[model samples]
Target chain A: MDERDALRISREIAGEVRKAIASMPLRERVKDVGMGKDGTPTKAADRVAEDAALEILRKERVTVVTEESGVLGEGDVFVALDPLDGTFNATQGIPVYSVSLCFSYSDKLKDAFFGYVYNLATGDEYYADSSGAYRNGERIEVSDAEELYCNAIIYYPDRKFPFERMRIFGSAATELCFFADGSFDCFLDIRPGKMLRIYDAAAGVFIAEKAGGKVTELDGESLGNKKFDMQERLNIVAANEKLHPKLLELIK
Target chain B: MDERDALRISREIAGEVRKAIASMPLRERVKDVGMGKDGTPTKAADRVAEDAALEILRKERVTVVTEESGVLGEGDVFVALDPLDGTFNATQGIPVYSVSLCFSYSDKLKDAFFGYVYNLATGDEYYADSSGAYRNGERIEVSDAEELYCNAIIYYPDRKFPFERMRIFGSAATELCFFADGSFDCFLDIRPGKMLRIYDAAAGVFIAEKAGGKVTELDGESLGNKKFDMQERLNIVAANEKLHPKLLELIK
Candidate 1:
């Protein structure tokens, strides 16, 4: 399927996923049902969301690499899916979680065509196509601040940094879009252990890139060589062109 | 005014404060209007909220100690008001900020009779009378967990702790209620710099204590002596009876 088809189908799946999880209370959502593809216990909400998303993708004849159930169906086009990016936040009634999807022609970041991250709690939609990135249907871009003392969204602030503000909303997908829309100056998940999986950062990086962000690996390398499979991990540093180098220097 | 009168007036003030902030666009919200009573730059939204709150509060026969305007008027009773607790989050549309108020017979925690904290974004009301605490009008209480590995809301994680989950949502008032309602096991702001002002923690501490949580100073001393004036500072450690000492030991 083409990029447009992929975007349309992804939104459709997101609708189903949202509907399935909306009415589930936190107590029920946190119940562990079974093991997921990543060897972690899948909560009821995670399974429900993953099932709804995969049910739609399966009918479209595309290969899917998802967090809950892993790879399913064989096709040339690969789609990395994180049905529920912030499971802990969702189960605790925090409003920062989201669904993320990234479609690629090959099993690598270089061939990515469409990316989407939708926040279910606030109904804010973020997506990117060849044309550009959009937040709630309006074109969005990164901030132009070049100072080290700017707003930042980081995973874990293990050490001190120069940013004026530091926040970790727990969902990389939604936090990345926060940078995409310039709500935050940048997004960094530079955990040396590479805790972020492809499903976590693929769609977010795609959207940020389209929004005029300079997203790259921790060492200032392009993510084009990153793999799309479930085993692939990530360490990202995303900011506008003017501030990206400053972040690299700070980290170094 | 009586405790009931304070509750009614606080709710009305919250309504006006919410309306004023809700109408502000984000671009205008982030702009600096003037200096606050706390010696920090006041954003447009902060000034608007403080104006709405102060307008309602001035009619009452009570002295007001607020973050934006400092101590105002002279009366037997004192009201500590944080017009907007998480201005940074609110300006950035993070959805975790709130308006907080605590009424005391004197400028000390021991005389506090009424407390209220309302989330402006979600409209979730948390308040406490002399008897108990309530969230959305439903009676609430703290969690029963006694382990240090339980969920916690901490300001800054400078050192390692045994909590299962650690989060800082940027708003002490709202997060304190999260602990009161059993959403989180405890709330601790052990920042050595003592960044919290009286307006930020007074209402939250009162509500948490009424909800069956033991809130105390950093060294496990009673918080009844904490002053309610604009100059007073705070470093809180709050949890249920079973877990209170556990948290105190963990930090010590």
Candidate 2:
């Protein structure tokens, strides 16, 4: 599918997911329902979000790799999805959760042609294609920071760091978009186990790259070979050209 | 004043502050204004919120201790307020920001009789009085988890630690309330500089304490002696009685 088709499909999916979540009460949202394909207990909120997201996605001709219910239908294109990224936040009425979508021609990061993430709470939209990356209709880009004193979004800060500000907002998809828009100087998931899944970082990586960011594995290797499957995992280090390498060096 | 009168005034103040913030765009909100009385840069959003909050508070016979403008009118009853906590979040439209107020009979926290914090984006209200702590009118309390593997809202993780989840939402006031209601197991601000101002943590501490949280300093000293002046600083360690000592030892 082209960028136009990707944007259209993503918007429709966002609309359905947002509506489903808006009606669910906070208490009901926190109840553990079933297990996720990602190996965690899926909450009641996750069920509604994934149900709504998958229904709209079913209309499109793409293979889906998603949270909760795994690989759905087979098609020419691949879509890595995290229907509800911050289930805990949404369960408590905190507004940082989102629906993440990344579309690839082949089932690999290198073949991604379009990426989209919609903030389910505030209704902010982030998407990218060959043309460029955009947030809500305006073009977006990464920050041009070179020092360690800049702001950072880290998975877990295990050591004393020089960053002026450090935050962990709990929603990988939305936090990635926050980085894509230069709201944060850099994003790092340097946890030893490399807990991030393909669906967690694919859309965010695609959008950030289109927004002038350089994203890579924790050791600074290219992410092009990252696969779009249930078994795939990741540890990303994303930032502007100048700050990207600095982060790698700092971690080492 | 009694709990009934404090609740009414706080609700009125919340309504005004919410309206003021709702009308401003993200661009206008982030503009850097002059320095605050506490030595931090006050944003356009901070000024707006403080103005809205103070306008309503001036009508009461209470001393106003605030962020941007610091201490206002010389009334007997003291109120410590962070007109807009999490200015950076509100500026970026992250939705974790709020208006915090702690009402005391005297200038010290030990004399605090009422505390209130209202989330501007979601409109959730948190408050406490002699009776008990409440969130949106429901009685609230801290989590019962005694293990280190529990949800935590920490200022910065200077060392490797154990926790099921660790979040830094950038708004200390709201984060404290999040702990107050058991959304997070504990709240910590162990920054070496002891960066938190009284206005930032007073209301939150009061509410959390009312919710049965053992609020203290990094060294486990009482926060009751914390004052209402702009120069006052803090490093809080708040958790339920069962988990309080575990956190204290972990930090040490």
Candidate 3:
């Protein structure tokens, strides 16, 4: 499908997922429904959100790789989806979760053409296509910061780092958009376990890269070979061209 | 004034500050207006929110110590006020900032009788009085988790720690309320610099205390001596009774 079609489907899925989660009470949202295919306990909010998003995706002619359920469909195009990205924050009423979607012609990250991440709590939309990246319909780009003492969003601040500000908002997809729009200087997930699934980082990485960022693996390797499957895990280190290398060196 | 009057005045102030901030555009909000009494650059959004809150507070028989304009009036009751906490988040439209206030009979924190923190972005209200702490009119309390592995909101993750999840949302006041409502396990501002001013932590600490949290300084000292003035900086360690000592030992 084209970028236009992907955007349309994403909007529909966002609306449905937003409504589904908003209607449920916080106590109900935090309940552990079952174990997900990603080897994590699935929350009620996650199950409801995935149901809403999949109902829309099933109509499209694409193979879906999601968190709760394994790969579905047998189509040429691949779609990496995380219906509810920040389930913990959502369950706790922290107000920073989202629905992520990344569309690709092939099952690899290099072929991604469209990326979308919609914040369900605040109704903020971040997406990118061939043209450019946008936040709430406005053109966006990464910050032009080359200093080590810059604002950073990291998964685990296991050691001291020379950053002006360090935050962990528990929502990878939404936090990446925060970086893509120059709100934060960089986004790093350098955990040794490599726990981040493809569905969590695919859309965010694509959007950040499209927004003048140089996204790569922990070792400064390209993410071109990352696949759209449940088994694929990631260790991202994304920043602008000038700052990306500096971050990689510091982490090393 | 009594607890009922304090709640009424806090609601009025919250309403005014919310309206003042909501009316400004993002470009107008981020503009650096002037230097604040707290030794920081005050943004236009901060000035507007402070002005709105002060206009109402000036009418009360209270000495107000705020961030932008410093101490005002010489009444019997003292009010520690942060007109707009998390100014950076508000300026960037990150949706996690608030207005905080703490009312005390004497100048010291030991006489504090009322605490209020209102999320300007999401309209979530958290307050505490002689009775107890409440979030959106419902009673709230700290989490029951006693293990070292628990959700934590820390200022500077300078070294390795045994926490399951760590976050820093930029607003100390609102984050303390997050702990007060049992949303997170603990709140730690362990930066050796003692960056948090009285207006930044007074209301949060009071509310968390009322919510059954054991809040103290870095060395497990009581915060009763903390004064409600612009000069008083703080370093807080807050958690439930069960987890408070464990966190203190781990940090020490």
Candidate 4:
């Protein structure tokens, strides 16, 4: 699909998901629905969000790989979807969860053409096309920080680092967009387990790269071959070109 | 003043400060205005929020000790104010910043009668008084988790820990409220530097305590004697009665 079609479809899905989740109370949202294909407990909120998003996405000629239902339909276009990215935040009314989507021409990330992440709580939208990345319709770019002591969004700060600021907002999809717009200088998920699912980081990685970031696995490996499936996992360390290597060295 | 008066005044101040900061663009909000009394750079957003809050507070019989302007007036009541907490988040449009206020009958936190933290981005209001703590007018309490492996909102995760989840949202005032309402199991700011100023933690500490949290210094000392002045700094460890000691031991 073209960027225009992808953008429209993403927006439509976001709107439906937002309304569906917003209408439910926190008590209802926190109910443990069932086990997900991703080996995690799916909340009532997750089912509601996925239901809303899939209703719209089903019309498109795409194979959807999602958290709750695993992969659905064998179609040419591959879509990695996280209907609700930060379920904990949403359940707790923390206001940082999101609905993320990454559309690739093939099952592999190298052919990604469109990426979208919408903050379901704050109504902020981030997306990327072949041209570039944008946040709320404004062109965005990564920070030009060349120092180790910079603002960072990391999954776990196991040891003391030289960064001036460290935050963990619990939503990799939305936090990746934070790095894309230069809100943070870098984004790292250095956990040894490499627990990040494809739906969690795909859209964010795509958007950050479009915004001039050099996103890679922990050892500086490329993410181009990452697949859109439930079994795919990731360990990201994303930053601008100049600061990317500095982060890698410090982590080692 | 009484609890009713405190709530009304807090709502008024929050309304004005919210409008003042909301009207400015990020470019204007990020401009470094001058040095603050707390030894940090005061941004345009800080100045704007402080000015808006101070205008209303001047009518009250309170000596305001704020981040930007230091101490003002010679009244009987003492008010610890972080006019705009999380300036970085505000400037970046991260949607998690707040305006915090703590009112005391005397100069010390032991006499605090009211605590308020209003998220300017999403309009979430958190406050407490002699009666109890409340979030958006609903009574709240800390989480009941007894294990060390519980959700924690901590600053400077310098070493490995057994927490199930760790988050640093960059705003101490709001993060404390998150703990007060049981959104998080614990809140720890164990920075060796003890850099948190009175204006940063007074309101949050008071609110958390009122919500049945056991808030104290690193060594389990009470925060009662904490002063409402520019020279005061703190290192907090807060959790519900069941979880407080466990976290303290884990950190030690």
The RMSD (Cα, Å) of candidate 3 is 0.9
Per-residue alpha-carbon lDDT of model 1 for A1-252, expressed as tens digits?
887898799889889988888989888999999999877789999999998998889997678989999889888889999999989888977777899999999999989999999887777789999889998788999999989999887765666667777777778998899899898999988777798999999999999999999999999999999998878899999999999998988887
Q: Which window of 10 residues has the lowest lDDT sum in candidate 3 chain B?
A: B156-165
The list of candidate 3 runs beyond 4 A from truth reads none
Q: Which stretches of candidate 4 lie over 4 Å from their true place?
A: none
Residue B189, candidate 3: alpha-carbon lDDT: 95
TM-score of predicted structure 3: 0.99
TM-score of each: 0.94, 0.97, 0.99, 0.99
lDDT by residue for model 3 (B11-85), tens: 999999999999998889999999999889999999999999999999999999999999999989999999999
Clash tally for model 3: 0
The DockQ leader among the candidates is 4
- Writing each residue's lDDT as its tens digit, candidate 1 over B33-136 gives 89987899999999999999999888887899999888998888999999999898898787788999999999888899999999998788999997699988
CA lDDT of each prediction against the hidden true structure = 0.88, 0.91, 0.94, 0.94
lDDT of 4 by residue, B27-108 (tens): 8999998998778899999999999999999999889999999999988999999999999999999989999999999999
Query: What's the CA error at residue B110 for candidate 4, in Å?
Result: 0.5
Instruction: Record all residue pairs in model 1 with backbone atoms less than 3 Å apart, i.e. clashing.
Output: none
Worst 10 residues of 2 chain A by lDDT: A52-61
Tell me the TM-score of model 4: 0.99
Q: After superposition, how far is residue A16 of candidate 2 from its true place, in Å?
A: 1.6
lDDT (tens digit, per residue) of candidate 2 on B45-108? 9999999888988988889999999899888899999999999889987888999999998989
